[PDB]
Ligand binder design. Structure first.
Ligand code: G16
Ligand code: CL
Ligand code: MG
Ligand code: MG
Ligand code: MG
Ligand code: MG
Lengths: 242, 242
């Protein structure tokens, strides 16, 4: 039937931490005369503007910053969501409080600031604090590997919550993420599944387990295609759609 | 002997929350041919630039953002000190552990992120979180006066950290500052002290007890003058140097 193309932005339509190239933007616009297109990224709408231009809403059929928590369709905002409204202030506080209480009891060499980073689609938690220096990150990550600090504090959170529909995911060097079950890139799919697309292609570059694009790639609702770079995305699109 | 003028920024050289007027800027420079001048404010270096001009450091003999924890003299940065090194890493971790445990215990309509912001010469603490939106900021502000949330917090903090050489100051809407005794605006006198000034004049619009200019005004190293606006600062300086 009719189809949709969904692209990760960073690493797929663009080179890592680089803006789109006029040549690729033009290919995509030519491709829209053949098929509906849309983009999905973990970054806020401001960042996505930096990456694809301030006219992005008018140039793509769908735009899904924040893994879809914000959604634009045919130039209008289709929907907007945040972790606060979903989980609720009560539950959002029970979680903050426990995290705070628990971090007060961790004996560390150092503590700094921003232990809780509130993002609209997750809560970053950092025993040391994100404001640490790079040399303090390393000191902590090494200590974590011998004492397993992050792993035990997720463990105790998975016991006390998680029946509230919460996922916990250790990542990077100093923090872990608390986000509702399924609020990875798969979230965006809810805004396009009821629009009548017999097949939804998806292109991304972190397609293997761990990556930003893994969970959406493996979803049975997508025709998943891995990519290595923008040039490769044109290559594949040229072959799929002539 | 030779002398130095030190000016509070907001309200003394500028109308509150506004840039300086070109009239006032060019006056100061005419004075500078008669006297070394300097400025001091609580705000980070970038904010000072926005009030006095990008090239502040070249137009003022001394420049003291963050009450002087960051300091420029004749264009170049002076030796620096941070709260971690002064108070020690145990009192920092014991003061963070306490603040964290206490926030977890506060019942509030909303809690968000960045409850402790780790600055060069202080720690904010925001019961609600500095990442809060604007609507949430006013909410906490207008509830705080009904239930004296911050006022009550600062009080218990003083009891527990009595004698530890720390000061506390509720400022603004959502937070209070914790800083070593002596790290108000009078921190900067450490730099201009000596350097052969027989008289150090100081101007400030919040001379009254509890104001950010009080302790530097009363400090005996300074010849303090209370100001009611930029145009008044002129009157006193025109009375003194003409
Ligand atoms: O309002 P906030 O929470 O951002 O607070 C801000 O302003 C306060 C005073 O500002 P003023 O004297 O102009 O009211 C400062 O003490 C505080 O460190 C700063 O973060
Ligand atoms: Cl925090
Ligand atoms: Mg990518
Ligand atoms: Mg698939
Ligand atoms: Mg002032
Ligand atoms: Mg004095």
């Amino acid at each position: 039937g009719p189809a949709l193309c969904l692209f990760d932005v960073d690493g797929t339509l663009t080179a890592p931490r680089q803006k789109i190239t006029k040549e690729m933007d033009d290919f995509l616009q030519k491709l829209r005369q053949k098929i509906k297109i849309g983009v999905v990224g973990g970054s806020d709408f401001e960042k996505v503007q930096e990456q694809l231009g301030n006219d992005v809403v008018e140039k793509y059929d769908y735009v899904f910053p924040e893994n879809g928590l914000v959604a634009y369709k045919d130039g209008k905002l289709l929907c907007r969501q945040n972790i606060q409204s979903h989980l609720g202030e009560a539950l959002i506080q029970d979680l903050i409080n426990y995290c705070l209480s628990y971090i007060a009891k961790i004996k560390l060499p150092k503590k700094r600031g921003t232990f809780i980073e509130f993002r609209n689609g997750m809560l970053n938690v950092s025993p040391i604090g994100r404001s640490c220096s790079q040399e303090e990150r390393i000191e902590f990550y090494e200590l974590d590997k011998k004492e397993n600090i992050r792993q035990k504090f997720v463990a105790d959170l998975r016991k006390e919550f998680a029946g509230k529909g919460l996922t916990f995911s250790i990542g990077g060097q100093i923090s872990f993420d608390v986000f509702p079950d399924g609020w990875d890139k798969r979230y965006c799919l809810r805004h396009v599944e009821n629009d009548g697309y017999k097949t939804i292609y998806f292109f991304g570059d972190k397609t293997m387990p761990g990556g930003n694009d893994h969970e959406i790639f493996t979803d049975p609702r997508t025709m998943g295609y891995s990519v290595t770079a923008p040039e490769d995305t044109r290559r594949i699109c040229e072959l799929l759609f002539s």
